[PDB]
């Protein structure tokens, strides 16, 4: 039982180049086993840490800056955690592949799941085409994140702590004065079940199983125990009395969050996983799927000598504990100021999405299924498919196309596409039964615009169940080889992922 609020919060370093000049830039990061101490009172726990670090070392770039980084693999050829050999397929057991989550980036450098390899490279996946991944940045400063992404154990590598924040700044900006340096801090939450010794539990089985049943089995779902921000259990975080950023990003497997401050005050949004919002929102409470990103403001400015606890109240597997989950981590502001707080939090953040849109070259209905496999397991699907099955999301280069998100099943699921930010239209309930029954789709009142939050450009969104989800999206500025899908990692695994082809004609 782990006392709460005794460590300090890490803050990631961030990574230095190996090379830079004005033309590149560029960096190696090495995944390693290593160990670190999670909480004061924990024996040091073993990770896969990027660079040796959990998180890994926070990357700093510009918008535009022409960036390289390879990304090696020194891993063990075996798993800490438990793998299961039915959910795939002669292949390494051990598999990586880094995703730049949010990323403009080519295909060949986004991380496809079949673009693996295994320690120096020596065996690679049947879409690999290169060590050195290029990031050009062409995008609008925002909050991305990297991670692991290689077929059929994204969730296992990413639960071993491979996870980074990665951050655009774009020059543009700082005209705005919104905090920066020690006053702009990335917050990276991942729930994690720690067993007496320090090691991490993950599940190696569903609940009481059936002795058919694969041994390793996935499970559909994890809900950690604790929740640790930039790898420590419960932290704290000494703050001066002043306006701070926060880069707020869900890294965990399963866990939804819906945080508070536990004073009643308030956040201030100012960009969403697709940079800044047109206008800042006042908030007292947001929704945090995986994969999610909020670029928050907090004015601890008339709180000086306080502790107030970033909280959360949405349940995992139950109702939140007030002693356990129910914490993120603790503001304590008693650092005193190293300066006047010269920073704003203005109302105008940036233009608005240009309203002439493109006009719309199709739309794509897509439903949210699961099947049950052959031990009984409940494999997640988009739209019926399965990875392996041909390509359907076949949108054309420089083209908009509207998605129609269907959901009928009992929870929501936090839906990413790679390479472009998209506009969220509105969500609209239905008729779960009669669309189960029938294949239509009957709506049970209007169609809800998203809230402020989703105004702006997101990457990853929560289609809740029981509702049409509908987004829209340029598809660009490349062409190639990238993916959909369910980013509750254990669903992603087991199948709730599909090829998304962007054609060049
Ligand atoms: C919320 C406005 N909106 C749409 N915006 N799309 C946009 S705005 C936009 C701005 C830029 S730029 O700012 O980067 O240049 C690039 C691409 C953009 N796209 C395409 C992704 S598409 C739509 C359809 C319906 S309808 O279906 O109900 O008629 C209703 C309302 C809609
Ligand atoms: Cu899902
Ligand atoms: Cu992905």
């Known amino acids: 039982t782990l006392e709460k609020f005794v460590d300090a919060l890490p803050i990631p370093d961030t990574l230095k180049p190996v090379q830079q000049s004005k033309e590149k830039t560029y960096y190696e990061v090495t995944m390693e086993e290593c160990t670190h101490q999670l909480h004061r009172d924990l024996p040091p726990t073993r990770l896969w840490g990027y660079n040796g670090l959990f998180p890994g070392p926070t990357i700093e770039v510009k918008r535009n800056e022409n960036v390289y980084v390879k990304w090696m693999n020194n891993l063990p050829s075996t798993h800490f ?142 809900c950690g125990e604790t929740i640790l921000v930039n790898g420590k259990v419960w932290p704290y975080l000494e703050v001066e009395p002043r306006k701070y950023r926060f880069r707020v990003i869900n890294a965990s497997n399963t866990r939804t969050y819906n945080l508070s401050l536990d004073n009643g005050g308030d956040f201030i949004q100012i960009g969403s996983d697709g940079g800044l919002l047109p206008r800042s929102v006042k908030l007292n409470s947001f929704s945090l799927a995986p994969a999610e990103r909020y670029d928050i403001i907090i004015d601890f400015t008339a709180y000086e000598g306080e502790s107030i606890i970033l909280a959360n109240s949405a349940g995992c597997g139950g109702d939140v504990n007030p002693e356990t989950d129910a914490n993120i981590m603790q503001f304590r502001v008693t650092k005193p100021l190293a300066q006047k707080d010269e920073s704003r939090k203005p109302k105008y953040l940036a233009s608005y999405p240009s309203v002439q849109h493109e006009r719309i070259q199709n739309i794509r209905t897509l439903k949210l299924a699961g099947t049950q496999d052959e031990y009984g397991r409940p494999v997640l699907l988009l739209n019926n498919k399965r990875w392996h099955d041909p390509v359907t999301e076949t949108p054309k280069v420089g083209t908009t196309e509207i998605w129609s998100i269907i959901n009928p099943t009992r929870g929501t699921h936090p839906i990413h596409l790679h390479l472009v930010s998209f506009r969220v239209l509105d969500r609209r309930p239905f008729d779960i039964a009669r669309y189960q029954e029938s294949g239509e789709l009957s709506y049970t009142g209007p169609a809800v615009p998203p809230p402020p939050s989703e105004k702006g450009w997101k990457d990853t969104i929560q289609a809740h169940a029981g509702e049409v989800l509908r987004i829209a999206a340029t598809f660009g500025p490349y062409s190639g080889r990238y993916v959909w899908h369910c980013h509750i990692l254990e669903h992603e695994d087991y199948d709730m992922m599909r090829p998304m082809d962007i054609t060049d004609p």
Not at 142 to 169: E, F, K, P, Q, S
């Open 81 to 222: 955690l438990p793998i299961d050999h039915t959910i795939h397929h002669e292949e390494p057991e051990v598999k990586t592949v880094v995703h730049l989550h949010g990323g403009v980036t080519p295909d060949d450098s986004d991380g496809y799941p079949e673009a693996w390899f295994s320690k120096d490279f020596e065996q690679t996946g049947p879409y690999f085409k290169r060590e050195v991944y290029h990031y050009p940045n062409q995008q609008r400063g925002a909050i991305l994140w990297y991670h692991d992404h290689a077929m059929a154990l994204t969730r296992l590598n990413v639960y071993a702590g491979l996870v980074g924040a990665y951050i655009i700044h774009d020059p543009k900006e700082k005209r705005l004065k919104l905090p920066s340096d020690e006053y702009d801090v990335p917050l990276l939450i991942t729930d994690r079940t720690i067993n007496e010794d320090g090691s991490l539990f993950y599940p190696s089985a569903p609940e009481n199983p059936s002795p058919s049943l694969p041994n390793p089995s996935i499970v559909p779902a994890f």
